[PDB]
Design a protein around this ligand. Structure first.
Ligand SMILES: O=c1ccn([C@@H]2O[C@H](COP(=O)(O)OP(=O)(O)O)[C@@H](O)[C@H]2O)c(=O)[nH]1
Ligand SMILES: O=c1ccn([C@@H]2O[C@H](COP(=O)(O)OP(=O)(O)O)[C@@H](O)[C@H]2O)c(=O)[nH]1
Ligand SMILES: [Mn+2]
Ligand SMILES: [Mn+2]
Lengths: 250, 247
């Protein structure tokens, strides 16, 4: 089955480094379609070039981000729109799969770490599948508790009230189910930490989640974050007109 | 031309995540032998297990530092010089007089596949720009007519080799020829790279790569320390994250 990976991304110092490791990870996975959505006003040459050189099956999308500061909400919904035939492709495969097509959708942020094994775990998803996520929610790992092959609770701690106390990287959704539920999307007005539940609540009930990763006993994905690079020297050299050559992409 | 990637690593929350993306990066590169050296009291099942299922050609070494991975890299150089020390993987080092290149890759940087094809063509010591390092967008040598004539750097420009560990590679023959060349664990901040390279070549003889140093094919990324406030509170309640589930 084909896996459609939804990844929002925005320009910043570490952007290319993040897309390089994510695209290189994805090149190790067969039958995978990358839906990269840029948080810009139009496509950027940095992303367009990386996609073209990646050698992956991809569709390039773009949508600008308009209190709770949720991130990548609009970009994730744009990919859902494209999948539901509302267009929006600025590059790559312009046409989305038609109804009846078997597939699984995974929302993969550009900074997390993904093992190649994780993708084979989600390839078998009928509705909504789940697995533990490492280093997230202030825990060593957060994840569903499984008994008799069924989800019977959650190992979590922060905002335990969440109907689905799981990170974006801890679940995948069957394509048919998303097309079958046109209203299912992420709610930008949802409280902090309730973004995942805003989508999932429209798709299934916690009891019906499909445990993957050896009945949720293996951590195959990590919610890593990259340190903001120090630019003190760059600033001094710039004030002296000797900044790093801008013609050299980083 | 085989590339020997020397990588020091140590146990901490993000270790496995880092080794997963590094091993996955290396799985895309042909003719590569990974020399993973743990900074531990003894080999850990986590690392041994990851190496075994990586499908990569490797040698597993271990040496504790009572910390920049200096002692670990030197143990990889000792091994390369036939002094043994392997506790897993390929135990026999390359025979004397073999061809090859050595690259010192820390476990948290980001490496593009293209970077590795550049260094295979190393005669003595090759160099290239490194992104997000030394406080700059990128740091790298200035090339004129295929020759390094200077360095785009800022932080203490007095270093004879003002380049990050990720910005160079050494030909295996040259390392065997200079059996006394190794990292100085006492070298002050920022002088680690110079402590090795000074034993091998003159800055003027560095071989520029990455299209005469106009391309950034490696980035000095660092990973945030994960928040564990919730974990601590759960521990107090006797329900911390199951130790049997490796992270
Ligand atoms: O203004 C922004 C901020 C973030 N993102 C992206 O949206 C996702 C989530 O943000 P981030 O990884 O920073 O979230 P966190 O680490 O805090 O969950 C990532 O794929 C980012 O590249 C974006 O497109 N625009
Ligand atoms: O006690 C330690 C600290 C670090 N390292 C490793 O040595 C290298 C350099 O350290 P680090 O990445 O933290 O350096 P920086 O990013 O600050 O230059 C990395 O491969 C680490 O995994 C190690 O083996 N033992
Ligand atoms: Mn993130
Ligand atoms: Mn580092």
């Amino acid at each position: 089955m084909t896996i459609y990976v939804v990844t929002p991304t925005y320009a910043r110092l570490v952007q290319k480094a993040e897309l390089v490791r994510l695209s290189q990870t994805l090149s190790l996975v067969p039958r995978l379609h990358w839906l990269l959505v840029e948080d810009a006003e139009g496509p950027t040459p940095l992303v367009s070039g990386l996609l073209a050189a990646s050698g992956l099956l991809f569709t390039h999308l773009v949508v600008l981000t308009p209190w709770v500061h949720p991130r990548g909400v609009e970009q994730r919904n744009k990919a859902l729109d494209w999948l539901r035939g509302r267009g929006g492709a600025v590059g790559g495969e312009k046409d989305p799969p038609p109804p009846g097509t078997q597939g699984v959708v995974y929302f993969a942020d550009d900074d997390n770490t993904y093992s190649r094994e994780l993708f084979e775990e989600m390839r078998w998803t009928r509705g909504v599948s789940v697995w533990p996520v490492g280093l997230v929610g202030g825990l060593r790992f957060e994840g569903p508790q499984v008994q008799d092959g069924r989800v019977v609770g959650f190992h979590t701690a922060w905002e335990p009230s969440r109907p689905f106390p799981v990170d974006m990287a801890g679940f995948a959704v069957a394509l048919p189910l998303l097309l079958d539920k046109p209203n299912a999307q992420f709610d930008s007005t949802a409280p902090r930490g309730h973004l995942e539940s805003s989508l999932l609540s429209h798709l299934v009930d916690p009891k019906d989640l499909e445990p993957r990763a050896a009945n949720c006993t293996r951590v195959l994905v990590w919610h890593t974050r990259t340190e903001k690079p120090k630019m003190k020297q760059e600033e001094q050299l710039q004030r002296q007109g000797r900044g790093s050559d801008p013609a050299i992409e980083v």
